[PDB]
Amino acid sequence: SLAVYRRKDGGPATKFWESPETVSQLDSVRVWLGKHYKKYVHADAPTNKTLAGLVVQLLQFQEDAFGKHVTNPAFTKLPAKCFMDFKAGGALCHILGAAYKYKNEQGWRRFDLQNPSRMDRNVEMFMNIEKTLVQNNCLTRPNIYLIPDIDLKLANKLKDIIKRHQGTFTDEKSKASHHIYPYSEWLRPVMRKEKQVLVHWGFYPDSYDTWVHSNDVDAEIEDPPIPEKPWKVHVKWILDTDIFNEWMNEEDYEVDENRKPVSFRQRIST
């Protein structure tokens, strides 16, 4: 099986982040930060690789603090896709800008994401990071509509999961991000660099996406579906989110308007 090399944790792929292309991609992030979060980054004058290392520290912190192994975490992991958005006004810029703004506000001499004494203030930073992403339209937490056919006892359990993971639920399908239907081993390649291919493991969150050698994955990378409000997924999308403390990839759980599972892209067996 290829699941041999599946990540056992949602920690950062440090080699991807230290790679020269990624360091190069952060250049526009550094420049954008210098213009719009200037009073918070001017002192530290972060280089491209310093930003890259900060991303590793940030990703490692939320996996250590809010990971699958943590019973009742104080917070839910930020989506891994947020850290993959290197565009000028994108999510990664607001992530780093919020981190530097928060550090300036607390008067910290430096980031210390390994200090157990600073756990609660580091959690506080991530809350400020999530708010910055949401209020700048880079992140939208699920606003969930439960199909009325779901058993009331299950629906109430799903409602508690949704609230414990920064989500809300609504009674008007008009404004729901997701519609949840009753529900009655593979991977998918998502990115290719060098001889490395990033693969997504079915029923695992995006932080568990693993860089593997392209010769072990002959499958073609297909185009991700374009988002049309709302996602139609079944209840295991919410149930699995509670397991990993990280909102699952909707593609793995999608159903059509008759509750039958569908997969826009191909599923490659492990």
Residue numbers in the entry: 27 to 210, 217 to 302
Quote the original article:
SWI/SNF (BAF) chromatin remodelling complexes are key regulators of gene expression programs, and attractive drug targets for cancer therapies. The BAF155/SMARCC1 subunit is a component of all complexes identified to date, incorporated either as a homodimer or as a heterodimer with its paralog BAF170/SMARCC2. Here we show that the N-terminus of the BAF155/SMARCC1 subunit contains a putative DNA-binding MarR-like domain, a chromodomain and a BRCT domain that are interconnected to each other to form a distinct module. In this structure the chromodomain makes interdomain interactions and has lost its canonical function to bind to methylated lysines.
Residues 27–383 of BAF155 were expressed and purified, and their structure determined using X-ray crystallography. We therefore set out to determine the structure of the N-terminus of BAF155 using X-ray crystallography. This shows that the this region contains a distinct structural module where the chromodomain, the BRCT domain and a MarR-like domain are interconnected by a complex hydrogen-bond network. Residues 4–160 form a four-helix-bundle that resembles the MarR-like helix-turn-helix domain10 based on structure homology analysis using VAST:11 43 aligned residues, RMSD for CA atoms of 1.9, score 5.1, P-value = 0.0005 for the highest scoring protein. Residues 169–287 consist of a BRCT domain with a chromodomain (residues 219–246) inserted between the second and third strands of the canonical fold. The individual domains are linked via a network of hydrogen bonds to form a single structural unit in which a highly conserved stretch of amino acids in the α3-α4 loop and α4 of the BRCT domain plays a central role. Residues 28–33 pack onto the chromodomain, and a main-chain to main-chain hydrogen bond is formed between Leu28 and Ile300 linking the N- and C-termini of the module. The N-terminal residues interact with a region of the chromodomain that in others forms an aromatic cage that binds to methylated lysines. The architecture of the fold produces a cleft containing two deep pockets at the interface between the domains. Computational analysis using PeptiMap18 predicts that the pockets within this cleft could bind to peptides, suggesting that this region mediates protein–protein interactions (PPIs). Six missense mutations of BAF155 identified in patient samples that map to the module are predicted to destabilise its structure as judged by Missense3D19.
